[PDB]
Ligand binder design. Structure first.
Ligand SMILES: [Cl-]
Ligand SMILES: [Cl-]
Length: 545
C-alpha cells in the first residue's frame, strides 16, 4: 500500500484535504476505493466530497456526475421549431461559448474562468426571468442546474470569492434584468420557493391578488439589506412611494425595481460621472473629451477598486489595453484626464519620443506585419479572422525565431484575404488604420497631456449626478470588450463614445428632449454644452423634491 504524510499527501504528489484532525478521516478512506485511479486533489469540506483532476472541480458524494452542456448540445435542447433565436437566447449561447473557451487553458477555479461562469448564470437566469412562457425554459433550467452545480464545486477553491454575488443580494436579482429584456410595466412575483419570477400565462390570479401580499416588496427590501445593510435599505425605501415602486401602486414592477437600483446608487455615490473637456490655448489645435464613470452601487475594495476605476474610464480605446499596446510596441504611464487636473501640490517623454519616431517611421506594408504579430490584442481588431492570423502569430512566437520569412508570408496572406472579401480597399484601410491610426491617436493624446502640464490650455470638469451608473458601465463594456467594438472606437471621436455612454445612463430622460449637436456630430464643445444642460436638468429635479 501507500503512506500518507503532512492538508495531507500520498506517495507511491497526490494531495488530500479535510475541514482536519477529526473522525471525518474515517469517512475519507471509505470513499476511496483504488490505487492508481486517484484524483490529483481530493477534499472534504461538508456533506459534499470534492476532487480536482486536471483542471476540473467535481462534487463527488453526499452521505453524482455533472457535465455542463456544450453549445451544440444546448442548440439541440433549446431548439424550438418556427421561432428565431432572439437576443436573449443569443446572449446565453455566447456566454456558454465564452465559458467552454476558458476551461481550455485555465483551471475552473481561476478567477477568469469564474467570472465567465458567473456571466453564464447571469444570462440564463435573466433568460427565464424575462421569458417564462418560452418553449426554451426546460433546456434553460437543465442548464441552470448544471451551472449552479459548477459554481458550488468550484467556489470552494476560488481564492477571492468576493466577485461571487450572494443568491440573496439585490445585485443577484438586478443582474437578471439585462438579459430579461422585460417591459417595465411587468410585475415581479414569487413562486412556490419564494424566488423572483414573472408570470405570463398563469398570470390572471396574481394580477387579481396584488395588494394582498407584500412578500415581493419585502423580498426586494430583504435583498438590499443583505447586501448593503439595514441602514441603506431603511433609507432608500423611506423615500420610495408605492407608485414609484409600481405603475398601478401595488407590489413592484420593473420600472420600480430600477428606481430601487438608482436610489441605492445616489446613496452610495452622489456623482454618477465626471466629464473632462480639454480646451487647448490653440495651435489651431484639437480639443479632447473623456468621461469617468463612478462606482455607483458597486462594493469593491483595494486594488480591485482601482482596477474597476481604470476600466470605467471612457475614451477612444479602453485604458488598460491602450496602455499595454503602447508598451508592447517598444518594450509607468498614466493616461487619464483626471491625472492632469491637479493644480500644483501633487512616461510622457520616452513614450512621446518613441511614438513620434514610430508614426514618422510608419510614414514611409512589410513593416506592418511585424507590428501586428507583435500586438495580437490589436491584430484581432483588424477584421482578419483569428484562424487566419494565429498560424503566423504562432510561427512568429515559438518556432525557432525564424521571424522575417513568416512576417513576409503573413503579408502575402493579408492580400489574399483582402481579395477574398470582395472589397480590398476596405480590408487594407482597416489594417492600416489599426496599426497606424492607434499610434497617431495615442501620440496626439500624450501631446495634449504634455500641453496641459506645460499649462497650454485648460481642463474642464463636469461632475454629473442622477444618471444610471450601472447602465453606463455596461454600455461602455459593450463598446470596448471585443476587438470589433474597439475598431469602432478607434475610428470615431471620444466625444461621441462618451455621448453614447451618457445616453445609456439616461441622459435624454434627464434633459427632457432629444439633444442634437450641430450637424449631428459630437465635439468636445458640444459635449460640454450637453454636460451643462444635464447639470441644469438635475437641479431642476432635485430642487423639485
Ligand atoms: Cl439586453
Ligand atoms: Cl479625443
Amino acid at each position: 500500500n501507500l503512506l500518507v504524510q503532512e492538508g495531507f499527501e500520498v506517495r507511491s504528489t497526490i494531495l488530500l484535504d479535510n475541514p482536519q484532525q477529526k473522525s471525518i478521516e474515517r469517512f475519507i478512506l471509505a470513499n476511496f476505493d483504488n490505487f492508481e485511479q486517484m484524483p490529483d486533489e481530493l477534499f472534504l469540506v461538508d456533506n459534499k466530497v470534492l476532487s480536482h483532476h486536471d483542471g476540473r472541480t467535481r462534487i463527488l458524494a453526499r452521505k453524482a456526475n455533472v457535465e455542463l452542456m456544450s453549445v451544440t448540445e444546448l442548440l439541440d435542447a433549446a431548439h424550438v421549431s418556427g421561432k428565431v433565436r432572439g437576443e436573449s437566447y443569443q446572449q446565453v449561447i455566447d456566454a456558454l461559448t465564452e465559458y467552454h473557451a476558458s476551461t481550455a487553458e485555465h483551471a475552473d477555479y481561476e478567477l477568469t474562468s469564474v467570472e465567465k461562469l458567473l456571466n453564464l448564470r447571469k444570462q440564463v437566469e435573466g433568460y427565464v426571468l424575462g421569458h417564462p412562457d418560452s418553449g426554451r425554459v426546460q433546456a434553460m433550467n437543465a442548464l441552470l442546474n448544471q451551472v449552479n452545480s459548477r459554481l458550488e464545486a468550484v467556489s470552494v477553491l476560488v481564492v477571492s470569492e468576493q466577485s461571487i454575488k450572494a443568491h440573496d443580494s439585490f445585485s443577484h436579482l438586478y443582474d437578471q434584468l439585462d438579459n430579461a429584456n422585460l417591459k417595465e410595466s411587468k410585475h415581479l412575483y414569487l413562486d412556490g420557493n419564494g424566488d423572483f419570477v414573472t408570470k405570463g400565462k398563469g398570470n390572471l390570479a396574481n394580477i387579481d391578488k396584488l395588494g394582498g401580499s407584500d412578500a415581493v416588496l419585502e423580498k426586494v427590501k430583504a435583498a438590499v439589506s443583505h447586501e448593503y445593510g439595514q441602514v441603506v435599505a431603511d433609507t432608500i425605501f423611506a423615500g420610495l412611494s408605492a407608485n414609484d415602486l409600481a405603475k398601478d401602486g401595488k407590489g413592484i414592477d420593473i420600472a420600480g425595481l430600477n428606481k430601487v437600483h438608482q436610489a441605492i446608487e445616489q446613496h452610495m455615490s452622489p456623482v454618477s460621472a465626471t466629464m473632462y473637456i480639454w480646451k487647448p490655448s490653440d495651435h489651431s489645435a484639437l480639443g479632447h473629451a473623456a468621461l469617468q464613470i463612478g462606482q455607483g452601487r458597486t462594493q469593491l475594495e483595494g486594488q480591485a477598486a482601482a482596477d474597476f476605476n481604470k476600466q470605467n474610464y471612457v475614451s477612444w480605446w479602453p485604458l488598460g489595453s491602450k496602455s499595454s499596446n503602447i508598451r508592447n510596441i517598444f518594450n509607468d504611464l498614466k493616461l487619464r484626464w483626471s491625472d492632469f487636473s491637479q493644480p500644483a501640490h501633487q512616461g510622457l517623454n520616452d513614450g512621446e519620443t518613441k511614438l513620434k519616431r514610430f508614426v514618422e517611421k510608419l510614414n514611409a506594408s512589410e513593416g506592418y506585419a511585424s507590428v501586428l504579430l507583435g500586438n495580437p490584442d490589436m491584430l484581432a481588431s483588424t477584421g482578419i479572422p483569428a484562424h487566419v492570423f494565429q498560424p503566423f502569430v504562432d510561427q512568429w512566437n515559438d518556432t525557432s525565431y525564424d521571424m522575417m520569412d513568416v512576417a513576409n508570408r503573413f503579408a502575402e496572406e493579408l492580400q489574399k484575404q483582402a481579395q477574398a472579401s470582395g472589397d480590398p480597399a476596405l480590408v487594407e484601410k482597416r489594417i492600416d488604420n489599426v496599426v497606424r491610426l492607434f499610434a497617431e491617436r495615442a501620440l496626439e493624446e500624450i501631446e495634449a497631456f504634455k500641453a496641459s502640464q506645460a499649462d497650454e490650455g485648460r481642463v474642464f470638469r463636469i461632475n454629473l449626478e442622477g444618471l444610471d451608473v450601472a447602465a453606463m458601465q455596461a454600455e461602455w463594456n459593450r463598446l470596448s470588450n471585443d476587438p470589433d467594438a474597439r475598431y469602432q472606437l478607434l475610428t470615431k471621436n471620444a466625444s461621441s463614445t462618451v455621448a453614447k455612454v451618457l445616453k445609456a445612463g439616461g441622459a435624454d430622460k434627464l434633459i427632457g428632449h432629444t439633444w442634437r449637436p450641430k450637424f449631428g456630430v459630437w465635439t468636445p464643445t458640444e459635449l460640454f454644452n450637453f454636460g451643462q444642460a444635464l447639470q441644469e436638468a438635475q437641479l431642476e429635479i432635485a430642487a423639485k423634491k
